[PDB]
Amino acid sequence: FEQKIQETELKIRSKTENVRRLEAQRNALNDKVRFIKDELRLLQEPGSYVGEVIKIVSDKKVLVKVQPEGKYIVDVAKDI
């Protein structure tokens, strides 16, 4: 049985070949379902208005006129 070790050692890494090929299949395929399940999450999301600036109040405070309608002081977000 001393050549039993011979035949099997190639059988192993020959088999790991497809598993990396399948670990590609999964993760490449998982990121698909991520998007559509992310996208669909937020078409349920609300609208978003549009408007124009008049000036800026001191900081973390500006004003806008919604182009059909009146004024609305606001705050801002982290980024801007």
Next chain:
Amino acid sequence: IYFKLKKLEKEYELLTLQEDYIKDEQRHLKRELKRAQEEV
């Protein structure tokens, strides 16, 4: 010669047990796919 090849057997039996987990989940996963790109 007679202890080393005992190891090489059991690492294989490890490997085969996960070769189906990676597989069957895909068989389990895809049922969510159309289940989601139908809700769209």
